[PDB]
Amino acid sequence: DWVIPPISCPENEKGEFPKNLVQIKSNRDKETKVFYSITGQGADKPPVGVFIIERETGWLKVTQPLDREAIAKYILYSHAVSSNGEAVEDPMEIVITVTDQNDNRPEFTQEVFEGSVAEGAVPGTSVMKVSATDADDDVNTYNAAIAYTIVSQDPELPHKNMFTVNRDTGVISVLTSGLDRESYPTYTLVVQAADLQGEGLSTTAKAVITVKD
Amino acid sequence: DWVIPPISCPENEKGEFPKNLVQIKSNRDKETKVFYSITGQGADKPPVGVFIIERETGWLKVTQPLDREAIAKYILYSHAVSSNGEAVEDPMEIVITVTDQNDNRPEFTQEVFEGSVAEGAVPGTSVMKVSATDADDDVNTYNAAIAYTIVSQDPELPHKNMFTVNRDTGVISVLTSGLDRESYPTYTLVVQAADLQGEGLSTTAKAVITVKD
Ligand SMILES: [Ca+2]
Ligand SMILES: [Ca+2]
Ligand SMILES: [Ca+2]
Ligand SMILES: [Ca+2]
Ligand SMILES: [Ca+2]
Ligand SMILES: [Ca+2]
Ligand SMILES: [Ca+2]
Ligand SMILES: [Ca+2]
């Protein structure tokens, strides 16, 4: 059977609703007056009424802004019924794909990460790892591509850049020498996670490093 | 059978070619690898290659700017063939409607219209009729809605507005009194026909009026 390929519809649509997606048609339009309807999740099943269809023209419409992180794909079924009340077609499967917008900030797995390092650890020694997730599309876009940075260091002694972070993995390492437990035993690093490879939306968390003997 | 409704494509398309129109699909995509093709006038028959289809994806494309005044409607047929060489679908009728642009100037049926009027004819007396046609869409648009005007009068005596024209019908009538055969026996009127109810493209012709006894 001839069918419509999956329809792509962007999430967070702005403006006037409803918006047209595609028009369906039964070739038995000539034989009899045909009326169109839709069933399935997104139509008559939860969430109800997100998609509607014009009964006479066959225009499939969307009634509200979509959220890809709530529902990313819809499977509907179109129906064709004559004025006499007989179904003139077998129900057609209609797929609606929701396409991504960068509307989710990266989120750290927890607010405070804790770590420790030996005082005499050589520069380049891995200490700890911070991690973040992103709810956006990590398959099609860079909307979930997280880059890690260090925003600030407290205290800024003996130098303000005692540690560094790997922007891909989130691993925090000793950058320079001069760590000293009996001078400055604790460091609070404010770490940032930004999507779009570092260019987009961002969030911050804390990395608390304790200096050991 | 489920079919695509007539596709509308504007004439005189500008930019990069080919341009996508619609995507077709056979549901037997899961069973076997399917290859798509198109037949009919506009595809493999004259005019050949105006519309093409991508064999694997099923994207119907247009390769060149259309001319509605040459061809206003195309009827194509889509085919679905498996990698094994069997037709997996009955050919589907695809209709392509060409939508109008205002790219045809109104054209008078002839260059010079001739007419005559009795000297003592009362103001308001019909003398002659000028007529024009327009190649554009007179059903859907105002692109063929012609309004008639008089541009100039030669000579401009005894007054410069001896005659007037009906902007709808093109009928030229005596506007004012003072026509005189033995003073000015001949008048050349330059008449204009403009589409968009008088606002669009225009052309001129001549109306030669001879004054009788
Ligand atoms: Ca969202
Ligand atoms: Ca998103
Ligand atoms: Ca994001
Ligand atoms: Ca020490
Ligand atoms: Ca044209
Ligand atoms: Ca035209
Ligand atoms: Ca015109
Ligand atoms: Ca006289």
User: What are the sequence ranges of the domains in chain B?
Assistant: 3-101, 102-213
Give the pairing type, strands A59-62 and A19-23. antiparallel
In CATH terms, are B3-101 and B102-213 the same topology? yes
Resolution of the determined structure in angstroms stands at: 2.4
A103 labelled as ligand-binding? Answer: yes
Structure-block tokens of residue A93: 């499967």
| Ligand lying closest to the C-alpha of residue B133 | 7
- Among A residues 191-210, those touching chain B with beta carbons less than 8 Å apart: none
Measured in angstroms, how far is the CA atom of residue A142 from the centroid of ligand 2? 11
Q: For residue B24, list chain A residues with Cβ-Cβ distance below 8 A.
A: 2, 5
Is the Cβ of B1 closer than 8 Å to some Cβ of chain A? yes
Q: Which residue type does A194 have?
A: A
What values do phi and psi take at B27, rounded to 5? -70, -10
Q: Select from B35, B60, B65 the least CA-distant residue to B47.
A: B65
List C-alpha distances in Å: B70 to A137, B51, B74, B140: 47, 15, 11, 17
CA–CA min distance A77, chain B (Å): 12
Q: How far is CA B80 from CA A64, A94, B21, B166, in A?
A: 36, 19, 18, 58
CA B185 to chain centre: 39
Characterize the bridge pairing of strands B147-154 and A126-129.
Answer: unpaired
Q: Do B1 and A89 touch (CB under 8 A)?
A: yes
- Positive or negative, the Cα torsion across B132, B13, B2, B74? positive
- As given in the structure block, the two tokens for residue A63 are 């009634």
User: What stretch of H or E contains A21?
Assistant: strand A19-23
Other Cβ atoms less than 10 A from the Cβ of B189: the count is 24
Distance from B98 to chain A by nearest Cα, in Å?
18
Q: In this structure, are residues B203 and B193 in contact, taking their beta carbons and an 8 Å threshold?
A: yes
To the question of whether residue A44 is assigned a binding role by annotation, the answer is no
Contact at CB, A5 and B27, closer than 8 angstroms: no
- Structure-determination technique: X-ray
Tell me if residue A27 falls in helix, strand or coil.
helix
Q: How far apart are CA A91 and CA A40, in angstroms?
A: 11
A154 token code pair: 């407290």
CA B96 to mean position of chain CA atoms: 17
Please give the distance, rounded to the nearest whole angstrom, from the Cα atom of residue B5 to the centre of ligand 5: 24
CA A121 to centroid of ligand 4, rounded, Å: 12
From residue B104, how far is each of B55, B59, B133, B136, B144 by CA, in Å?
Answer: 37, 32, 10, 6, 8
Q: Which residue of A has its CA nearest to B25?
A: A3
Asked if B25's CB is within 8 angstroms of A5's CB, the reply is yes
Q: What is the DSSP string of chain B?
A: -EE---EEEESS--SSSSEEEEE-EEGGGTTS-EEEEEESBTTTBSSTTSEEE-TTT-EEEE-S---TTT-SEEEEEEEEEETTS-B-SPPEEEEEEEEP-S----EESSSEEEEEEETTPPTT-EEEE--EE--S-TTT-STT--EEEEEEEES--S-S-SEEE-TTT-EEEE-SS---TTT--EEEEEEEEESGGGTS-EEEEEEEEEEE-
Alpha carbon distances (Å) from B178 to B119, B123, B156: 8, 10, 12
Q: Which two tokens stand for residue B56?
A: 């694997």
Between A and B, how many residue pairs show a Cβ–Cβ distance under 8 A?
50
Task: Write the residue in A1, A27, A28 that is nearest to B27 by C-beta.
Answer: A1
Residue A19 CA to residue A117 CA, distance in Å, equals: 58
Q: Are A5 and A38 in contact, with CB atoms under 8 Å apart?
A: no
| Bridge partner list, A189 | A153, A207
Chain A residue numbers touching B58 (CB-CB < 8 A) = 5
| Burial annotation B2-36 (CB, 10 A radius, 16+ → b, else e) | bbbbebebebeeeeeeeeebbbbbbbeeeeeebbb
How far apart (Å, rounded) are the C-alpha atoms in residues B123 and B119?
A: 11
Just give the CATH number of B3-101.
2.60.40.60
Search chain A and give the residue with CA nearest B89: A1
Q: Which residue of B has its CA nearest to A93?
A: B27
Q: Output the CA–CA distances (angstroms, integers) from residue B89 to A3, A90, A135, B64, B144, in the order listed.
A: 11, 16, 41, 28, 42
Cα–Cα–Cα angle for A174, A176, A180, nearest 5°?
80
Look at residue A22 and give its three-state secondary structure: strand
Report the CATH superfamily, name and number, of domain B102-213: Cadherins (2.60.40.60)
